[PDB]
């Protein structure tokens with residue numbers, strides 16, 4: 001589909017057997033989700049944003065379905081105020097900017 | 100044009116008569132540019148992202164040309180790590196997400 005930018009581009013995602021709302025973010029290199037207790041091994045990581053860095057847990061080869069489009073990649077988990085879908089997964093669903 | 104997201108969606112912008120690189124950012128409500136001199140009055144403002152808040156200078160009704168498309172709106176100037184074009188101007192140039 002096509003998503004205008006009058007409002008935040010929020011969509012429903014399915015991850016780890018749960019449905020959530022997440023922000024399609026062309027300005028994010030990575031995907032960062034609110035605190036959730038995903039299973040499996042993880043690695044510590046620091047991600048920097050506009051106001052500084054936060055600590056996150058890096059999960060690899062995680063499946064996320066975005067508007068029925070499936071994508072598998074690295075998912076970071078930490079105290080982010082908003083679930084963010086970054087380019088690492090947006091590319092996998094064929095997402096583009098158009099103007 | 101149509102822009103894929105395998106690399107950062109960086110484009111050339113023209114503001115105050117000067118050329119710059121900026122990130123087309125659907126995950127940003129506002130547009131924030133690195134420290135620079137801009138004509139016109141400004142008022143202090145705070146914006147928050149991942150990591151916390153930063154203090155910025157808010158310039159209203161600023162002309163800015165984004166990839167050959169003219170926009171006139173609010174431009175924030177402050178210690179952002181990258182020049183970011185947010186939704187307030189992406190809507191003006193008719194930018195949409197598509198997948």
Ligand SMILES: COC(=O)N[C@H](C(=O)N[C@@H](Cc1ccccc1)C[C@H](O)[C@H](Cc1ccccc1)NC(=O)O[C@H]1CO[C@H]2OCC[C@H]21)C1CCCC1
Pocket residue numbers: 025026027028029030031032047048049050081082084086124125126127128129130131146147148149180181183185
């Ligand atoms: C109302 O609140 C906003 O509108 N605040 C906006 C905002 O910071 N939006 C955030 C989401 C969000 C929204 C609300 C609260 C918390 C977080 C996403 C945005 O695209 C940033 C842009 C960026 C790019 C490079 C460096 C720094 C920042 N990307 C990001 O931080 O990505 C990170 C994960 O992956 C990494 O790659 C790139 C950086 C890493 C600001 C307002 C105008 C400018 C941005």
